[PDB]
């Protein structure tokens, strides 16, 4: 019930046009915990089951061993959307402290928050 | 034609369920310029025409004087999505250097990238 940043969920991204996005599939919570409590929506980063390997610095690799997702996947930090909390179906796992820093660094690159 | 970070566009957020999001309305480009060139999609932050005043630190105020939007508005940095570039209709203006830093600071709060 409590939505925390770094948690791996399984929301319904559909219907989102055009390409890339689809139906019920895993995401990761990137919204801060203060907004995670009181906002009616949540910011999620996409988890792709397609060609799964870090292609760019805005990609972070996650494994089907430690995380309940199907096959080896990649966090898409260049593919983001904000969902109303009612779209989250069920939670899977949560990211490690070291894997969350990997997301925190790639997220500042795709948003150009460095320099 | 070149999409730059901080530019104010006018994309078609529809169809995005459930509430809050609607049809053709202004956004601001928050994706970094390296991804702005070669990615098929772009990350945008919502511009709301509703109750327009900074309510939380993830809000940034923008004016209808300097910017071609209708009435005084607010940048919603807690309401984000990634659009395929074909959804951008026409560009309006671009944010000032000082107003972009206001967005850059509020964006790190809603994503919990500080501490």
């Amino acid at each position, epitope marked *: 019930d409590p939505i925390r940043r770094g948690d791996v969920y399984l929301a319904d991204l559909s219907p989102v046009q055009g390409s890339e996005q689809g139906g019920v599939r895993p995401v990761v919570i990137i919204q801060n915990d203060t907004g995670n409590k009181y906002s009616p929506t949540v910011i999620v980063a996409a988890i792709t089951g397609r*060609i799964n*390997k*870090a*292609k*760019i*610095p*805005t*990609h972070v690799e996650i494994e089907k061993k430690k995380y309940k997702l199907d096959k080896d996947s990649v966090i898409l930090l*260049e593919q983001i959307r904000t969902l109303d909390k009612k779209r989250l179906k069920e939670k899977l796992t949560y990211l490690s402290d070291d894997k969350m820093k990997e997301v925190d660094n790639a997220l500042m*690159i795709s948003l150009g928050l460095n320099a | 034609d070149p999409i730059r970070r901080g530019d104010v566009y006018l994309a078609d957020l529809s169809p995005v369920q459930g509430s809050e999001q609607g049809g053709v309305r202004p956004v601001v480009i928050i994706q970094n310029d*390296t*991804g702005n*060139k*070669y*990615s*098929p999609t772009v990350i945008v932050a919502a511009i709301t025409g509703r109750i327009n005043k900074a309510k939380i630190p993830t809000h940034v105020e923008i004016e209808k004087k300097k910017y071609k939007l209708d009435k005084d508005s607010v940048i919603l940095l807690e309401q984000i999505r990634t659009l395929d570039k074909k959804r951008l209709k026409e560009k309006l203006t671009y944010l000032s250097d000082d107003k972009m830093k206001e967005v850059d600071n509020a964006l790190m709060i809603s994503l919990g990238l500080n501490a």
Partner: nanobody, 128 residues
Framework: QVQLQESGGGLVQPGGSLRLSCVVSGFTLDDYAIGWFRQAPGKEREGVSCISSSGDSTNYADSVKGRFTISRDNAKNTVYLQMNSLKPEDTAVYYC?????????????????????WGQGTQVTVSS
């Protein structure tokens, strides 16, 4: 269709030079980023350098910058890797690999990410 093939391997003395070529087939060279990956025995595969699908951005590894220079000729569908100041520790099997992902090798990074479509290897040795 068919893909890549590397040529130009051989034996060199320490401090020598060599130019590796990479022929491309079965796709447009302007649609794929091409990278160079070497693999020494007993060691994990190491990325060396990549070219963007457009050609405006080039990245290299720290142990390489100032020595190897990646180049592309779109008219020939041929990618080059000019290897200079060759150390005996550069002995490995070099591969040129293509990847159809948008934005690959565009960011300025010291790490080249693994590609998807590979080619036949080439042997580069360097010792007295």
């Amino acid at each position: 269709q068919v893909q890549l093939q590397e040529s130009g391997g051989g034996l060199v003395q320490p401090g020598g030079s060599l130019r590796l070529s990479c022929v491309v087939s079965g796709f447009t060279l302007d649609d794929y980023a091409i990278g160079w990956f070497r693999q020494a025995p007993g060691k994990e595969r190491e990325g060396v350098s990549c070219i963007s699908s457009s050609g405006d951005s080039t990245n290299y590894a720290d142990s390489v910058k100032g020595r190897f220079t990646i180049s592309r000729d779109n008219a020939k569908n041929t990618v080059y890797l000019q290897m200079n100041s060759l150390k005996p520790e550069d002995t490995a099997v070099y591969y040129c690999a293509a990847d159809p992902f948008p934005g690959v090798c565009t960011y300025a990074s010291s790490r080249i990410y693994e590609h998807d479509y590979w080619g036949q290897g080439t042997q580069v040795t360097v010792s007295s």
